[PDB]
């Protein structure tokens, strides 16, 4: 069906955290809590922190999937535009059509769902390193929101699912994403619009 976006903290108390990156002119990834929205540049590192109240068991997996936010587009699969699909920029793990990649994890797996045709990217859950409070995944978004052959200026959500080894739901969180040239400027603009409406 249409993928769920509903927050579900679940038995392990699953939350997402993001860095405090501000709105400077050269910022590459920044998160607006007031919009629950990440603004990032194409292909740049986007750290997403997994915070759990208790440690889910070995074999747990973490899946990321993009959907269109607007109800009239939610049934359309989010894919890279043809230009970027053909530009030969895979890291050798990601299929060239996938919007969302994970960098720095050799155990990443990329899925094309045999029925829904939706793309997702999944890594094994690992607990925080010693001295760390959370587990960080480094995501990359491989098209701009404005890519005319693809997202074509339509907002997307990223859904992060904690799953057991069989794919059963353990927890779910989501955030809006805009992939753009100037994330700091656009964050400041959209936060100003919200404060005025």
């Amino acid at each position: 069906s249409v993928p769920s976006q509903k927050t579900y903290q679940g038995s392990y108390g699953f939350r997402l955290g993001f860095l405090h990156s501000g709105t400077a002119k050269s910022v590459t990834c920044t998160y607006s809590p007031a919009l629950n929205k990440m603004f990032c540049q194409l292909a740049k590192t986007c750290p997403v922190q997994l915070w759990v109240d208790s440690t889910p068991p070995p074999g747990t997996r973490v899946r990321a999937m993009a959907i269109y936010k607007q109800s009239q587009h939610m049934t359309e699969v989010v894919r890279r535009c043809p230009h970027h699909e053909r530009c030969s920029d895979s890291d050798g793990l990601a299929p060239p059509q996938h919007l969302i990649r994970v960098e720095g994890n050799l155990r990443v797996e990329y899925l094309d769902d045999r029925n829904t045709f939706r793309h997702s990217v999944v890594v094994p859950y690992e607990p925080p390193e010693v001295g760390s409070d959370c587990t960080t995944i480094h995501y990359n978004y491989m098209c701009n929101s404005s890519c005319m052959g693809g997202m074509n200026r339509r907002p997307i959500l990223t859904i992060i699912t904690l799953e057991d080894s069989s794919g059963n739901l353990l927890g779910r969180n989501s955030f809006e994403v805009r992939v753009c040239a100037c994330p700091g400027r656009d964050r400041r603009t959209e936060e100003e619009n919200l404060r005025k409406k």
């Binding site: 927050t7 579900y8 903290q9 108390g13 939350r15 955290g17 993001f18 405090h20 998160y31 809590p33 007031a34 629950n36 915070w51 109240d53 409070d133």
Partner: protein, 124 residues
């Protein structure tokens, strides 16, 4: 709903957003899906200044989440030394047991937080 927004502002450490929401009377004792209040969330993430403003605003220092943890449990478990000290000053209950029977001291011990365990034992 301003309580839902205050929960997320406190979790994400957005001090200006916390101030605006509280200036509009957002419910300081709102609870998220896990029963955590803004004070729980700020304690967990280590946002000391947000913890302090919530305590000056009548947040329940001993509110319990769905697992029976108070904010002091969270601060002791994850190693938030300054937050432990301000919670104790505000009347946090060192004897409160969560649903695993653990006090904040027990969680400090279990997580290797030696300095915090000493602070809690002196306050026992």
């Amino acid at each position: 709903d301003l309580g839902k927004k205050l929960l997320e502002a406190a979790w994400h450490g957005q001090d200006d957003e916390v101030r605006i929401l509280m200036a509009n009377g957002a419910d300081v004792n709102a609870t998220d899906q896990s029963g955590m209040t803004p004070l729980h969330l700020a304690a967990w993430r280590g946002h000391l200044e947000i913890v302090e403003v919530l305590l000056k605003t009548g947040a329940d220092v001993n509110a319990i989440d769905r697992w029976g943890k108070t904010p002091l449990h969270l601060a002791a478990r994850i190693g938030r030394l300054e937050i432990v000290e301000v919670l104790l000053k505000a009347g946090a209950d060192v004897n409160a047991q969560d649903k695993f029977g653990k006090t904040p001291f027990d969680l400090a011990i279990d997580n290797g937080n030696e300095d915090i365990a000493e602070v809690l034992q002196k306050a026992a």
